[PDB]
């Protein structure tokens, strides 16, 4: 019911948001290839049941529904993707320091989401007066089996590969 912004938001938010989603959709598969190639066996072969889009607590998104509804769900996804990639980048730097291309393409993906976060959270605030949203975060991978740390990060980039195409398909 209450929302206020100091200064106005960026012009053409829906164009920026859709340009942000379409940019993430392009680099989605390249980050998928870069990941499992750095993990080695048995990931580039059993890429189906180890690196698939099966992620349990991943937030939902329905293509139907109003622009406010499609944007609050997108807010929870981008928050979920932010904590995971921050964890996965931490996990990978200990396991795989050799692949410095996977690190730089994980920092890129992380920063595009945070720029997309202001576009989504403001548009809720400036137009629908959302103010604040309660979100959920992913599981912490700080102390887990190395294979599970590798496998959890695999399934995330697989689900992210499939969910980002849905988001880029909608909106406009």
């Amino acid at each position, epitope marked *: 019911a209450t929302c*206020a912004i*100091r*200064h106005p938001c960026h012009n053409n938010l829906m164009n920026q948001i859709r340009s942000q989603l379409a940019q993430l959709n392009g680099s989605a598969n390249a980050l998928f290839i870069l990941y499992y190639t750095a993990q080695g066996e048995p990931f580039p072969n059993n890429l189906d049941k180890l690196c698939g889009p099966n992620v349990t607590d991943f937030p939902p998104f329905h293509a139907n529904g109003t622009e406010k509804a499609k944007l609050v769900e997108l807010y929870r996804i981008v928050v979920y993707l932010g904590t995971s990639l921050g964890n996965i980048t931490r996990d990978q730097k200990i396991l795989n320091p050799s692949a410095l291309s996977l690190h730089s393409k994980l920092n890129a993906t992380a920063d595009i989401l*945070r*720029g997309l976060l202001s576009n989504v959270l403001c548009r809720l605030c400036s137009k629908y007066h959302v103010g604040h949203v309660d979100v959920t975060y992913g599981p912490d991978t700080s102390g887990k089996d190395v294979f599970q740390k590798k496998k959890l990060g695999c399934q995330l980039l697989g689900k992210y590969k499939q969910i980002i195409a849905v988001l880029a398909q909608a909106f406009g």
Partner: antibody
Amino acid sequence: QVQLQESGGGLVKPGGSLRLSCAASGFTFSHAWMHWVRQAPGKGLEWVGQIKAKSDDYATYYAESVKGRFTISRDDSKNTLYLQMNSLKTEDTAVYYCTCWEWDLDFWGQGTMVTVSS
Amino acid sequence: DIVMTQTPLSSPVTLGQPASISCRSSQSLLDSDGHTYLNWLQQRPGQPPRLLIYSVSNLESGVPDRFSGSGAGTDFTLKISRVEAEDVGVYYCMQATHAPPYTFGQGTKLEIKR
């Protein structure tokens, strides 16, 4: 946390040249709109110009008082904001402020002094 | 071209007494989206400008509730219900609707009696 620190001020002869640098840390720089604002000794506040991100193709806008003579740059890889001022005049003697104007946050730097005299 | 005119200071406000500053614009600040992009800044001596009240009446975190915001269209008012020795400074008002360019007021210096 969030910090903005300018650097590049000093003494520059009239009709000269100068390049200021504002280094940021604490927020997402590749998405923030950055502005420059100056305050002449014993005067008010005057907006100088802004710059945007890569989505807007780093679009710049300038106040008519400095248009054609000041140039705003940004290096997203270093989180650094620039202001290349050529053809300086004695009116430009002011404290130049680095500021970030956004719905998320409003933050002003500490300012650096540019003095134009012979 | 937008101009921002402020009523200057009439006398040093005695400690604890209220104070009123007002900005008056040349054109309406109500935008098409429904928001009125009018801010209020404060510059303590030696310090850079900081934001007090944004979008007419909404306070900034870390600013005491003595400050109040009000106004509509072209007329606005800054309200301090009690004056303490930290409020001495210059107050500006900034618009962001018809932008660029962004414009400020000349500034209302506040003095205190004791």
